[PDB]
Design a protein around this ligand. Sequence first.
Ligand SMILES: CCC(=O)N[C@@H](C)c1ccc(NC(=O)[C@H]2C[C@@H]2c2cccnc2)cc1
Ligand SMILES: CCC(=O)N[C@@H](C)c1ccc(NC(=O)[C@H]2C[C@@H]2c2cccnc2)cc1
Lengths: 470, 468
Amino acid sequence: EFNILLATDSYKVTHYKQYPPNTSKVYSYFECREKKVKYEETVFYGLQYILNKYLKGKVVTKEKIQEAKDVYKEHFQDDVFNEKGWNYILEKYDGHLPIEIKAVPEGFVIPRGNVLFTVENTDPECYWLTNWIETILVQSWYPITVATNSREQKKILAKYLLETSGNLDGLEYKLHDFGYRGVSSQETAGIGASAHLVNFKGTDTVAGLALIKKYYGTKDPVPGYSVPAAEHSTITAWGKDHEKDAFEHIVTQFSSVPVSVVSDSYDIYNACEKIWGEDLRHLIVSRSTQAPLIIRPDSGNPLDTVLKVLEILGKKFPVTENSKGYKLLPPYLRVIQGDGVDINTLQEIVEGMKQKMWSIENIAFGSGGGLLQKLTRDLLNCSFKCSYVVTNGLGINVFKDPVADPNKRSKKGRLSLHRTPAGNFVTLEEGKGDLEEYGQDLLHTVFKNGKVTKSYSFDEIRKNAQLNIE
Amino acid sequence: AEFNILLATDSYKVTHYKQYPPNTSKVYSYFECREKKYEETVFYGLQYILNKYLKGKVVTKEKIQEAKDVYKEHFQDDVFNEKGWNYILEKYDGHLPIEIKAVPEGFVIPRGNVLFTVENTDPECYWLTNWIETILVQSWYPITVATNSREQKKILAKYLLETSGNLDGLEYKLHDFGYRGVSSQETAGIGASAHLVNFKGTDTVAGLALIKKYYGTKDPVPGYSVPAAEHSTITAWGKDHEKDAFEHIVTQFSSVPVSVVSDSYDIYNACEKIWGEDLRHLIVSRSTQAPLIIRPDSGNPLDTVLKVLEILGKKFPVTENSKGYKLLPPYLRVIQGDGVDINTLQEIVEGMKQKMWSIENIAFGSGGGLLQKLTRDLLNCSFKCSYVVTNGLGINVFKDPVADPNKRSKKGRLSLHRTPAGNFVTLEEGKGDLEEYGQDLLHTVFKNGKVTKSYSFDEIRKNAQLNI
Ligand SMILES: CCC(=O)N[C@@H](C)c1ccc(NC(=O)[C@H]2C[C@@H]2c2cccnc2)cc1
Ligand SMILES: CCC(=O)N[C@@H](C)c1ccc(NC(=O)[C@H]2C[C@@H]2c2cccnc2)cc1
C-alpha cells in the first residue's frame, strides 16, 4: 500500500538540511510556463484526484516512518532521513499534513503563465514538507495536458463540423478514447481517460468511469459511452474466405444500436466495394438513423485511406448534398478513423476532407497513444517552484533566473490570480493581491491540514471547460 | 473501490463474446514487438501484471454486479456476459482458466519474435483470451523503458571504454529523474523498475518497493542515490547569498558525494567565481568517494557541459588519462540532467569525445526522456490472435492489410527457438511440434489463476546484460 514518505524524489529526503537555518515557511506555486500547436490556454484538472487519493487523512503512521527509515538507510548508504520531522506530524497532528493548498476551480481555462495552485506549510516545523510533496503534485501535469490537448482537438473538430455542416450536433462523440492499451499503466489509463471525458463523452477506457465516480461524481448515469464494435480477432477467427460471414453475423447481432466493424483485416477496399457495397448492402441500407454501420479502416495513410473509403462508398450508396454544399453519406452508414490519430493528423484529415468537399458529419475519430500517451511535462512547461520563504521572522521573494534560459525564470513572492476589468486573468506577484485592485483572488483553499475543504463535481468541471464557440 | 478485471478492458471487448464464430472452443493469441534503431528488446514486466492483476480470485459476485450496472449505462443496452463471468465464478472460484507461456524475463530478443502467448484452458471461456489483451499489452511500457534504457547503456559503455579504457561505474552513469515527469504513481514504479534492469542510480523511490514486492534482490535495495540540492534549497537563501547556500550544503554533506544545482542565476559565474575561487578550498579538500558534483540545468545541453568543463579546467588541475583524455581531480564531477534523451546523450558523449574530455567526468540524469517520452509504436508492441478451434477444427488465422505489409501477423500455434548460429526464430503453423532444433524458449508463467514460474530481479539483470 501507499506511503507518502516513499512518494518523493530521493534528493528531497535530504532538503530539510539545506534550507537557511530557522526557515518557518516555504511557499511554492505551480504554473504552465509561457514557451506547431501553441496551446495558449490550459484546462486546470486533476488535483482533486491527488488530494483525495494521496494527501488527505492519516497519511503518516509509525509503520510508514519505520518502512521509509530502513529503505533510505540502504538507498543513501547513510542516515539522512528526517525521522524527527515525520514523527512530529504523527504526534502533533495524528499523521495529517500541516499543508494549505489554494487552486483555481477545476475545469477553468486559463492562459499560460498564470498561477494554478499554491502550496505552503501551516506549521513552522514543517517548512520542509512544502517541497517534499512537489513530486506527487507536479504529476497533475498529466490530467492538465490530456484535458488541454483534448480540448484543442475539440476546437479543430468544432471549426470543421460548423464549416461543413452549419451545426455542432454530436460533437461530444467525434473524438473517442481508444487509448487503454497504449498507456503506461492502469492508473494512467483512469487519469487520462477522465481528463478526455472533461471534453468528450466517447470512451473505451473503462478505468476513467470509476475514477470520475469516486473522486468527482456526476448527476448522470455514466460519465462516458461506447457502442458494440469488432477487432481483427473477431473477424479473422472465421478464416479469410469467411470475412463476409463475420460481417453478416456481427451487424445482425447488433441491429438496434450502432456497430463499428473493422474492415481492413485483408483488403479495406474490397470490403467496402464488394462486401458492404454489393454482398451485404441489404442489411446496411435497412439500419436505423440511431443505429448505423460505422466502417473502420486501421491501416495505411490516414487521410488517403479515409478519402478512398468515402468515394468507394459514394459509388455504392446514395450520397446526398447539404446546406453548405458538402457530400454526406446516408444516415445508416458512418465512418471511424482510429489509426494514427493525434492533434496534427486530425487537423490534416478534416482539412483534406473539407478540400474533397466531404462533410465532417460522415466521420468520427478514435485516438489511443496520441491522446493519452504521446504527451510530456514539457508540452505545457508544467512547473513547481518556490516563490516565497520566511526565515527568522523575515519573508523574502525568491525565484530562479538562469542566464542561458530566460523562459525558466519563475515568479516572485506571494501570488494571486485575478479577474481583470476586461474579463481576463492576471497573476499578481509580491503579495500585491492583498490590495484587491482587480477584486478577490480566484484561487480557493482546496486542502488544509489533512482535509479537502472544497470539491468540484465533474459536471461543474465540464461546464467550466466549455468552448467559447461564438 | 478496488481493482476489478471485469472493468479492466476496452469497452468493445465486452461485446466480442457475441462476435466469434459459433462453436469456438479456443482463441490463442500472442505478443511481439513487430519489425519495422532498437534491433533487440528486453522482455520485462509481465510478472508484475500476473501477480498484481491476474492471479487468484479476480471474480466475485459483487464484481459481476458492479460491471453489469456500469455496462448497462455505458452501452445503453444489455450486452454483458453475466452468465460467462458467473461460470468462471462457480466453476473455478473466480480463478482465470487461461494459460500464459512467456520467454524468460530479462531476455534480449530481436524484433518480430513471439514474446508470450495466451490461450483459454476451458472451451466455455474462448472469449477470455482477448478480454485480457488490454491489461497484457500494457507490458509494452516496462519492455520499452527497459529496451531504451539498455540502448543508452550501449552508448555510454562505448564512449566510457573509448575515453578511459574501462567500464567502471557504468551502472551509475544514467540516473532516473523522471518521478515528476511521468503520468501516475503506478507508472513511476513500473518505469523506475525497468530502468533499474540496466542501471543502479535512481531518484524514483517508487521503483524500489515494486522490485522488492514482485521480483526481489539478494542486496537490500536495487537502486541508490546521493544528497542533492534543488533551486528552492539554493534560492531560499536569497539571490546575493548563493555562496552561503553552496557552502552550507557542501558542509552538510562533507563525507558523501553531493550534487549542487549551480545555474539558479549564472552557471558560468558559480563555476568560475564561487566554486572556482571563493569556495575552492572546500572542493580541493574533499574525498574521492565524496566529490562535489556540479549540476548545470539550463541552456544548450552540449555547449553548457563543455563551457562548464572549460571553466573548471582553468581553476582545477586537469590531468591526462591512460587514453590521453582530460580528467578532472577525483573530488570533482558534473551531472547533466536537463534535456537528456537517447539522441541528446549521444550528442553530449559524441561532442565531449571530439573535445578530448573523458566520459569519467560526467554522469547523466534523465526524466521525461527516460520514462515518459516513449509510446507503444516505438517497438510496435502488438497482441494478436494466431490460432482458433471452431467445431473441433483448428484453423490458423492472421491479418494481412493490403495497405501495410509490416502489420501482417503470424499464423497458427507458435514457439520460440535459438538456432545453432545463436540467433532466434519463431515457428508458425504448429511447426514447433516437429522438434527440428532446440526446445521452446517460452515457459508457462501462468495457469488457471496461478503464477507457475517466477524470476528474481537479479536473474533479469543477468539476462539483460550487454555482450562486452
Ligand atoms: C457512444 C456514441 C456513438 O455512437 N459513438 C460512435 C461515434 C462510436 C464509433 C465507434 C466506436 N468504437 C470503435 O470503433 C472501437 C473498435 C475501436 C477500438 C476501441 C478500443 C481500442 N481500439 C479500437 C465507439 C463509438
Ligand atoms: C548512486 C551513486 C552516485 O554517486 N551517483 C551519482 C552519479 C549521482 C549524482 C547526482 C544525483 N542526483 C542529482 O543530481 C539530483 C538533483 C537531481 C534531480 C533528482 C531528481 C529529479 N530532478 C533532478 C544522484 C546520483
